[PDB]
Amino acid sequence: AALALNRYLCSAVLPLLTRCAPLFAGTEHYTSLIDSTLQTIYRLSKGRSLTKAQRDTIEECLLAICNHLRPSMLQQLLRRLVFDVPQLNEYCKMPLKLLTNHYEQCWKYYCLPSGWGSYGLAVEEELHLTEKLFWGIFDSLSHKKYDPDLFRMALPCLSAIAGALPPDYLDTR
Amino acid sequence: TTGHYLALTEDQGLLLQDRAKSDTKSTAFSFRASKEIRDIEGMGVPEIKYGDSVCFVQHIASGLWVTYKAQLKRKVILHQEGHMDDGLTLQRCQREESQAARIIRNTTALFSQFVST
Amino acid sequence: AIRIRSILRSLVPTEDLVGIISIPLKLPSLNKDGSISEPDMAANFCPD
Amino acid sequence: SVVVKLLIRRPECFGPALRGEGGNGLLAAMQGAIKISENPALDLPSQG
Amino acid sequence: VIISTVDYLLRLQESISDFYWYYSGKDIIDESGQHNFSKALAVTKQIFNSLTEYIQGPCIGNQQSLAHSRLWDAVVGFLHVFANMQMKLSQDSSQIELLKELLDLLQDMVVMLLSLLEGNVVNGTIGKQMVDTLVESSTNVEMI
Amino acid sequence: EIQFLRTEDEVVLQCIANIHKEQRKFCLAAEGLGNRLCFLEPTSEAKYVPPDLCVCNFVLEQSLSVRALQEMLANTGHRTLLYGHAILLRHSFSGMYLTCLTTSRSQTDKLAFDVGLRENATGEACWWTIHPASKQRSEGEKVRIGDDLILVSVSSERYLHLSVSNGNVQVDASFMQTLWNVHPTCSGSSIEEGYLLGGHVVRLFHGHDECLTIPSTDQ
């Protein structure tokens, strides 16, 4: 039953969501629903019995969906990533690429005091989360045996996070 | 403009009758060239002519003739033999007039039911 | 193409499709005793 | 095109649910099928 | 057998008219279209020769049989195709042979009509029918 | 011929429905202003209730073929009808063309459109294909007077079907088929004018000025 459900999700549902990714833009009124969706899809990426193609489909759908959401609707997901990405396990390529894309496309939302036009300026909680994520990944990567793929994936994530955080972000914690 | 058929009602003689009560016995008339005592499957041959021909209207069942009642606004009745000036000529009305008349009938029925769901 | 698509749309409305997709499934559950209770997949509504 | 024309010419190829007169709809048909499945008296053959 | 040949002629004429309607919108006829047109024209030429053989001599019975059949519809349709295709194949320099075949088929049809006119008195019935048929397709006759 | 239908020929489309063991005949009808949907005027009990054939009269305008019709659409005389052709019907009263209306009002059916009138003949909705109802007639044969036809909408690919339900008779475009008898009422070859024909609206003059009238239209 689980195998059949996975085949249905990865061959009918998830590609359909991936193609309809642009329609997720401008859905500020459904945030909670969207949030829940993201969680489940993220929880499907860390599957046990998934094959390579199914996991690739799940990760691609997650990346495409997150690419069109505004920074306000990703925070919950990022919070979960703050507990997972610093570990730097096998399932780190997709979270690293997602963080890279988000913080490299939405850098004005975090860096410029004015903000990114209609998207508006960030908030202290989001900047604190970004800084915590950066420090966790940096410290974890500092204590890793040299692996070319892991370092190659992790470097752009750190660069994007640093280039998004304002240089003078004083964190009151 | 009314949707009623010329008929020979028992109580009133020659009269306009409803489409519901208009059977062939009541409502069936013929044009006759003079008062002297089938189903062709095609266009037939032209017999009656507009303006040229003088037609006498006879009730098919009763056999009576359409004649004006003796005394202008003359009344009309069905009579056994009838006068000698009982011939009726015919003129075809224009398409606009006939269309407008049917539209008048429909509109009057509708608005009258609306001004009596 | 437009004629065929119109015929297909008239045959099955989107309400029916969305209702069918919304029908809950009966998936296996883990019993308290430690045994897996797997519903029969030949006599139930399935994702297929 | 040929298959759609042939099927529409004969609506019974769509089954009882998609027949024009008396049809309950695809969703109604699927829900009725699930109801049949849940009841062993309506799907399985007789014991005898 | 006269009526059977006429019936097959009508079927073939309808198919040829469908092909012409297919290629009317297009600018030039590809190789496959020319191949199939040539084969259809060959078959039509043979059928016209068969009918001409049936009625010549003259055979009064076969002439009257053809005059009362649906041959005139085939004549009208073929006049349409000839008139609209010989002014369309002549504009392309790679369609000379197709034009020659079309012209030969027209010649065969006209010979069949002349055979129908054999033994025809002044003001005869078949002459009147042929005049009516040519009047019905007067646009295509004028184009030819 | 007296047994072949030609264009410019005013005809009535009649259908037979078996109700209560009696074959009741009906004619397709429509009205110009107000109601543009087609209904069925009963012409079976015509001895006791007059039938209104004014609105049942349609004119066979054109009789193209399928490939010719497609070419005519893409581009933007008294021909005889042949089985398998696409014909155009014009209402004789209102001048509107019979059309397969996309909107539907048939609760019983699901893919049954409506049949109505529309002012202009633009599009493929107003062209109907003729098919034989028996194996004796075959595609391409001339359609004869008194033959049962099958009318299929060129656009929706639906039959001009008559629906019977609880004594109520309607006409709509549906995937079920019904056989129609096209009865001619006036031949196209009727150029001669000036004589009294059936259905003509006339004034009956007595003397020169007097005519047959009534007091008022108000009932």
Side-chain angles (χ1 to χ4, degrees), chain E residues 19 23 29-38 98:
Chain E
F19 231 72
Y23 272 107
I29 312 185
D30 36 348
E31 296 303 344
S32 184
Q34 291 185 357
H35 190 65
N36 294 310
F37 259 112
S38 301
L98 202 56

Side-chain angles (χ1 to χ4, degrees), chain E residues 6-16:
Chain E
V6 172
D7 299 357
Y8 181 66
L9 181 69
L10 286 173
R11 290 169 50 206
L12 190 58
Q13 182 270 298
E14 295 173 357
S15 60
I16 291 174

